[PDB]
Paper text:
The DyP structure is formed by two domains, each of them including an antiparallel four-stranded large β-sheet and two or three helices resulting in a ferredoxin-like fold (plus two additional β-strands). In spite of the obvious similarity between the two domains, only the C-terminal domain harbours a haem cofactor.
Aromatic residues were changed to serine in the simple W377S, Y147S and Y337S variants (the latter with low refolding yield). Moreover, most of the variants show crystal structures largely superimposable with that of WT DyP, except for the mutated residues. The proof for Trp-377 being involved in the mixed protein radical was provided by the W377S variant. In the high-resolution narrow scan of its 9 GHz EPR spectrum (top), the tryptophanyl contribution observed for WT DyP completely disappeared (the spectrum of the W377S/Y147S variant, not shown, being nearly superimposable). The W377S spectrum (top) shows a single line with hyperfine resolution at g=2.0046(2). Simulation of this spectrum at X-band (bottom) confirmed that it corresponds to a tyrosine phenoxyl radical. As a main conclusion, Trp-377 appears responsible for the high-turnover catalytic site, since its substitution (W377S variant) completely prevented high-turnover oxidation of RB19 and DMP (and decreased over 40-fold the catalytic efficiency of high-turnover ABTS oxidation). Site-directed mutagenesis showed that high-turnover oxidation of RB19 and other substrates by DyP takes place at the same tryptophan residue (Trp-377), identified previously as forming a protein radical. Acidic pH optima were already reported for [name] DyP, and are also typical of lignin-degrading peroxidases (LiP and VP). It is interesting that a delay period was not observed in oxidation reactions with WT DyP, and its W377S variant described below, which showed identical reaction traces and MALDI–TOF molecular masses with/without treatment with VA and H2O2.
Author numbering: 3 to 448
Write the structure that this text describes.
């Protein structure tokens, strides 16, 4: 019953283009905006069906999403069923132990009405599409802010700015995806509003959409690299190899993608590259106490925080299916320049770079907001551990600018604690609703 022809492609497939632009806009003269929304945008919005087929990847892939104030600007006063969306991300900031005082000023408010996501293999093609939009909409659309993003170059293609292969793990949608070994399998309504087993009643025109949580997350890459070298556990290999082990313990995967739960002391690049094997784990190991054993993967490791698997019950053998309702689909892409020679040499960031983080979910409170607040920022999550104080997620965990206490990272002693400065700095973002395609030229243009 999942009508993928009507679902925007970034939600379930991803744009998978070299370059992306996030174009954050305001609406003036809504009657004019609406005419062009229907005539100029709706026909070129890329669907899941379109992106699922090579023969039909468009030259420029385009998606569009609206904030609460953007829907209101279009005269849409309906309750979409999500209080977090309605209130906007700025009002949610304190839930994550940050302040909007640190944000890009355009995000610290509700002036942004929407985002157009443009993706293409060159920036020139994106620019041409933006020029076309500005030409036909005229002054009815106004750019408030934008952020350019790119797949990283060379041997870092598909890796985020710290160097780790990204985009490996996603929930499988039951009835749509063919699940990979170890992959969680969830009802479509966890991700798509109004789809199977979404318990929240939605406006009819909104069935087939998703909520988009956007975060501009700066990464302090030279600082991270230097921290790992300075805190590398003693051992037989090179200093860099031991630093790499510590980084892998923090993320829960080696940079190659190999999950540490399956290879806890050394990388396995072949495993990392193999989608049939690189997700096939639950954190359980026969003969080890799940509640205390951190020898395979720390309880505080990023991926263990964000998908706890057996830490939240369910099958000890793959696939673990726990906490399906707390799943998110991720379509983030790195932004900013590569690390420059001088920054690396000084172990100091000068230019801003990071992750243009994008999460899709049908309930913000169950997805992004939950994972940040209840897990990453919670020293006592996952529950039931010994010792009980897991500490914060070393990658994304926040405590109002203070160093984060993170336990279990050191293989030699699970009781050893590290106090870690932030390596990821929030510059804010917004919550949007990516409508079904039918609503774009339909209700939203009416
Ligand atoms: C700059 C910030 C971030 C970086 C560098 C980062 C990096 C990574 C990496 C390297 C992985 C493992 C690769 C993969 O499984 O695809 C991962 C997985 C994941 N991340 Fe993060 N991430 C960031 C922000 C976030 C945030 C803010 C959240 C949610 C609040 C989040 C949620 C997840 C989830 C759900 C997974 C998959 C877990 C699983 O299914 O096993 N990430 N991330």
């Amino acid at each position: 019953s999942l009508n993928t022809i009507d679902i925007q492609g970034d939600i379930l497939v991803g744009m998978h283009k070299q370059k992306q632009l996030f174009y954050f806009f305001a609406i003036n003269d809504p009657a004019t905006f609406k005419t062009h929304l229907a005539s100029d945008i709706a026909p070129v919005v890329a669907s899941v069906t379109q992106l699922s087929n090579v023969a039909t990847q468009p030259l420029v892939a385009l998606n569009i999403a609206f904030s609460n104030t953007g829907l209101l600007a279009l005269g849409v006063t309906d309750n979409l069923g999500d209080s977090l969306f309605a209130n906007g991300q700025a009002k949610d900031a304190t839930s994550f132990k940050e302040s909007t005082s640190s944000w890009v000023p355009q995000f610290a408010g509700t002036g942004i009405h929407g985002v157009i996501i443009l993706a293409s293999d060159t920036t020139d093609l994106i620019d041409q599409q933006v020029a076309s939009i500005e030409s036909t909409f005229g002054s009815s659309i106004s750019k408030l802010y934008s952020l350019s993003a790119s797949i990283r170059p060379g041997n870092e293609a598909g890796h985020e700015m710290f160097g780790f292969l990204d985009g490996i793990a996603q929930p499988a949608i039951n009835g749509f995806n063919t699940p990979l070994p170890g992959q969680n399998i969830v009802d479509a309504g966890v991700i798509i509003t109004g789809a199977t087993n979404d318990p929240i009643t939605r406006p009819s025109w909104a069935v087939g959409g998703s909520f988009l949580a956007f975060r501009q997350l700066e990464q302090l890459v030279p600082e991270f690299n230097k921290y790992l070298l300075d805190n590398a556990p003693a051992g037989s290999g090179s200093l860099q190899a031991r630093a790499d082990l510590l980084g892998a313990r923090m993320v829960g995967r080696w940079k190659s993608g190999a999950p540490i739960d399956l290879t806890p002391t050394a990388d396995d690049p072949a495993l990392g590259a193999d989608a049939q094997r690189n997700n096939n784990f639950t954190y359980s190991h026969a003969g080890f106490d799940l509640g205390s054993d951190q020898s395979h993967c720390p309880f505080s490791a990023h991926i263990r925080k964000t998908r706890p698997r057996a830490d939240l019950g369910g099958s000890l053998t793959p696939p673990n299916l726990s906490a399906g309702a707390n799943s998110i689909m991720r379509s983030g892409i790195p932004y900013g320049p590569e690390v420059t020679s001088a920054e690396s040499a000084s172990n100091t960031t000068t230019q801003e770079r990071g992750l243009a983080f994008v999460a899709y979910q049908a309930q913000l409170s169950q997805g992004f907001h939950f994972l940040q607040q209840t897990s990453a920022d919670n020293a006592n999550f996952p529950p039931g551990k010994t010792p009980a104080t897991v500490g914060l997620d070393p990658i994304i965990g926040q405590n109002n600018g203070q160093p984060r206490v993170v336990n279990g990272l050191l293989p030699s002693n699970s009781s050893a604690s590290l106090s870690i400065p932030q390596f990821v700095v929030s510059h804010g973002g917004e919550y949007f609703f990516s409508p079904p395609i039918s609503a774009i030229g339909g209700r939203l243009s009416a």
